[PDB]
């Protein structure tokens, strides 16, 4: 198997969608990395088009619990989900090739039932909406305004100008 | 057709689900009848579980925009919009025979897309279910607090309990 | 139109499945005869598996509502709501032919969602079981002690037998 | 016929989604009244949840094109192409019941193909976007840039809302 | 493989919505890693949307039936069964990672068939709620009228307010 | 393992439809061969229809991220992303089989939703666009204006033919 | 009409699968025709496959119920429920057209439930095949146990054979 | 595996439906458990919402079949045939958790087909429910009018409940 | 019928697809007109997306066959064939209201089968973007190699700009 | 592995439809075969009923881009690319058993989309077309115009049939 | 494996439909065998209810292509290319157990196309209808006139007359 020879190198690829299997995955070879050498640092290879939104957390808080500094590189590109991932990479070791593509949005999703339901469901989105903005931000350096008004709708942009605004800090170029 | 020899006779049937189609149906009828005679009293029997709410309120609108007083009787049932409808007749003349069922409740419905947009449907049903509240209020003689809490989940009660409610006047049994 | 010219001569004909939109058909017929002759006796075939509840219950309180008798002719066979309806014909009126078997059972039904809405579900269900028990134990002069455990499972019988058990008065021939 | 009839009164019912096929119906509807008076004024009530944008636009210059002034009243729902319709009536005969609810927003497409073909979908599009809101701006008193803001996204309103935005002038309460 | 290797570092994973299939591997670890050794802890991470009530109640039975303590850690979401689960960690070992969401609500199901069919599963699902609201009192230490107020309807809660809620003990950070 | 007999003398293959997994693992095995000898020369045997663009262009940027010379042999056919692909080898080895065809175009998409939404998948696909024509013309020698209007509608050519373009350097006789 | 002229003639046509509307309508026509004379003998058509058996019952009982005499024709087939009702036809106006086919047998059924439920479905389709065999051993001269015998499966005749067996009374050759 | 494991530690887990795939799964390790050593006792957990009969009645018979004890273990549930087989555990050794749930009921199925087809499979049903009582009653100490008395319907019970009963021996709680 | 009084005034309506049966029954009405009055005007109100090729030719052969003018007035929009046939109106006499939109362009088709099957197709197809080519740009004074460059793609138009063009004479504005 | 094992000895099979799954395959044991021997003649034992061009295009052009002859055994059927390959088989070395099928025929296709597309379709398919019938008239040493007419259609033979018409060498007997 | 442990025995089953797919395997299995052994016989056990000719034919071209001898026993049934395979066997080693059945059809297929492509179909299959006739003539000694006229349709056959016929050569009872 290939992957798992690269998984020996430290480094652990997230194609495709995001989801609690993929998730539940990604989660795991970033503990099993950890307990391997708490220390060195990981490579999170990302070309994800996104994914269910508490999936994408999982993968986060553990980049965060874990020991080594988890380093995130985008190839293809890296929407939604996808390009909160690669910002929560570890400040300053957060890369991008050339011609990769990045793109992040605000949530979307669905409510169905009585009044008092939808309400619920909404304000639930509405909640990780804020969560997720304030986390882009916050890795950005850009402020929380101007975030809500670029997630708005879909915001592409290339490697080198995710750059300028705060998403990656090197394109490997 | 023996719909339309009734209707010789002003009696409209809202049977079944309500949507524009039907609701349509029963507003041409209620313009023509008016058009027929504006002094007369309109016979509305009601067997329905409801259905679309911008639909019901087309036919609510309708009777209070004629000048003949809408005579609401239900039969069988009237659910939901169907009992909202019931509980519009014309004060005094809102009757059911005694063995239908009536059932109020909140508002049903279903949001798709971005957070931005589930919010604004969201908005939208909580509106017309705080619209409906107080109508339903108003015609029984409850308090909205009251209305609220019995509209919260399915009210089913029986058309003598209808009465004591407020949603009917007599029970022509 | 040859339903046309047999209601001519005040006779109905319930063929099939119950639902709204017969149950309005019926009622539309049963309102227009009393228009035509409130006197003379009305002729109810029925030859139906039964239905939905509350469409029958339409049917039902109708029957009771106009002035006429409704005399009922159970032809082919009367289940459910059905032989429910053939029971409910004016005392003295309610016949059938020599190969019509008849059946009466508890109410069917579904209940989906929370808990607390199931709950409703299943206590309207069970409204209706003992009202269709009480007004079936009063049109045969069973007590409601037997017809529930009569109708706790479907309970066919021949025209004979329903006409001793009290649901019809005569087996015409 | 119930709706032939009420065209006979110079009453016209546009309710449900508008294509084509319903467009021709009001066209020729509108087309035929033309003839029957170029005086008197029309009546064309308002139920609709919107529709194919051409097949919208046939109907405004229809009314447009004819005589008689074509008066707008909005019962139920006017929304989306239902809502640029009801704004487009004879200014000063734009009415709405009370209870009715306005909802105007932008255009909705699909694209699929090559880049070629999806930029020409996406100008055609946008060109009808800016052609309704200039419309829908010069109808309401509003400014192009106003219009163009508030229609972002789903703008639901209250005929008493919808009547101070500019879109109808009197509300029949 | 990566969940193998993690097991024998007693950590086991829960990921996805539950049902016996699921329950069955989970509990044959929760077995298996009290036969490797019945004294050092157990790590069970969480991040379901929930499932099956009889079969997260399986996983619950076992996971205090072994001898070891079973630490719960919320990564991502833990939902309807999945928070109840959470709960049921070992007292004092209920953890959660700073972006994950907890949610507890009222069972849901349904039921077809004859109106005693009906009723003997809307009070057996009534029971699993009486039940479940009292098993999460417990472990919350709130009191079950208030456990049965918040869970009406869903309850969505951030790591925080599930600590202070009572559903967990500390929060990683 | 016949392909992890022929990655062992550094080959690789890229067969049919091109996608995030299809690409994710060309890139694995780009970066495996890398680690494995950063120096030798790696063989890209492509034999595609083309693909998803970002992800062609995972690959495409992997080819020049890593350090060996990776040179690409059509066989069969590499259309769209896969000529693309094709004409991105390393400068001098860029080789096709004497009967393999070779295609080139321009992106194929699709959008739905608000004109503004439309507007931004057109934007960014012609983004795209502009990308890969340039990049090709960069890989043949040829001016943007000329690959601009030769890959308006598909452009096929033998291997000959794609040799005087500039897309390979030479026709494995 | 076709149908219609001939119905004026008291010819009934009963063609193809019998079930709840077909027989309905043979019934309409049935009673239609004694009303307008009660004595001119009827003509009832019969070329079919058979049907449901209550909705046979009902035309037989029908027949039999009227004072006019219901003489039967047999042309292509009567098979099943459709060879019973020719054999019910009024006595020595029993026929059959030469080439046409006779074919008898026992009910056919199904059942799901419980074992409570199917255990009553048995004793019922039981008591219909016994009922049915009862009747065909009065209509043709064969004894019970004949009958039964020979329906245990299907049993196909000829016009001829199906009077030698004393099925019909002539064979209009 | 997993499961292996525990088998070696002579564990057999009996999850999810039950069919000839999962019956012929259980005796294949019931038997083999044996051949390994025919004095140790077997656990035999329990997970089922029941299954097929025949399979419920071949797991049943090995139980008894084979050397060694079978010990049931409940967990999660045990319904219909899942409660039949935990109580057929070795007399004594047959437990449960205490939150699971014990149910029992008649058997479930249907037929299609010739009268005496469906006599026949009633017959069978009606002659496998006896067994079923019988076995059932025997186990728990329950009279065979007791028994069938209370499995005419589901009947639910709790783990207390059900050693209360007979079907279980001890509560491990 | 609403639609036939229109005919009596020399109207008729091409509204939506066009296929043979929509082209069967243009053709009808125009050499119904035709007879009906050879030297007075037929006005051909136009509202389709366009169609099957040959059906168009149908109709427009029909238009100048028949010895009135046929006047095309477009309202909505008239594209693809749609447009073909609004230019093909009398010289003079080609309106469209203000905002309608018009769109030309080159044939869509298909081919299966053989090498030599799908040339014939292909050259076919051809030879009808010739002939129409040639058709639309007689009508418009625009050169046959403008045209075919300017409908290579989807060419869409205002009233105003197709006026400008040549498609249509004036604009009722 | 059976295949495996036969691989061993230079052995390679293609069975069924070509395509570029089937065709890499193949593709990839040349190669290794090759890297294994380049002296040592490979068997490739084909029963194929043909596939996409491309697919075998890819076979054919590594048989003559490796050293190894490459022989070609047919068995069953070799049937268009099946055909086509059975005769790219090292001259001298192209055999078939007395009992295969050889059929050679013309490329199928399908095309969609604007005249445009169509038309650079067609020309593909007939490049392919060509350069088909240019190998089969050299492999066969037959004249480009003898292959031409003998391609039109479906073309049967039978090995011997084929050996002589020049598609293989020899018969094995 | 089992099979692989028979096939140590040049034991070879062929179970069910014959396809390109299941004979590639019993020709690798074949070639394998005598490769191991040229000398040792192979024995075909056949239970096949037949299927692709040219399958079939790949078979029977491999058994007389390899050295050893390939008995056939026919187990359970060989029809159709079932029984031509059994009938080509080695003679003096076809045999077939005693409860077996043998059946000899004609060729089944079908068309579709143009007139010119349904004859060429049709020829062919002719064609190969003669051919295995043929065979099947000298396999059994029987005339073709004979063979022919057998096969015509569907010929079954017991092991015993299979043996008379001259298809089998012992029946190993």
Do not use: W
């Amino acid at each position: 198997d290939i992957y798992s020879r690269l998984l020996k190198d430290r480094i652990v690829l997230l194609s495709g969608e995001i989801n609690d299997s993929v998730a539940s995955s990604i989660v795991a070879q970033l503990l099993f990395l950890e307990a391997e050498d708490p220390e060195k640092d990981i490579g999170l290879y990302i070309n994800s088009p996104g994914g269910v939104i508490t999936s994408g957390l999982s993968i986060y808080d553990t980049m965060n619990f874990i020991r080594p500094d988890v380093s995130t590189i985008c190839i293809g590109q890296a929407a939604a989900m996808g390009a909160f991932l690669l910002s929560c990479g570890a400040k300053g070791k957060r890369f991008s090739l050339p011609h990769s593509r990045i793109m992040i949005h605000q949530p979307l999703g669905g409510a169905q039932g009585q009044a008092s339901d939808i309400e619920i469901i909404s304000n639930e989105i509405l909640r990780l909406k804020g969560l997720m903005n304030s986390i882009l931000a916050q890795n950005s350096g850009q402020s929380l305004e101007q975030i809500a008004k670029d997630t708005d709708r879909d915001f592409y942009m290339s490697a080198k100008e995710a750059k300028e605004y705060g998403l990656i800090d090197k394109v490997l170029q």
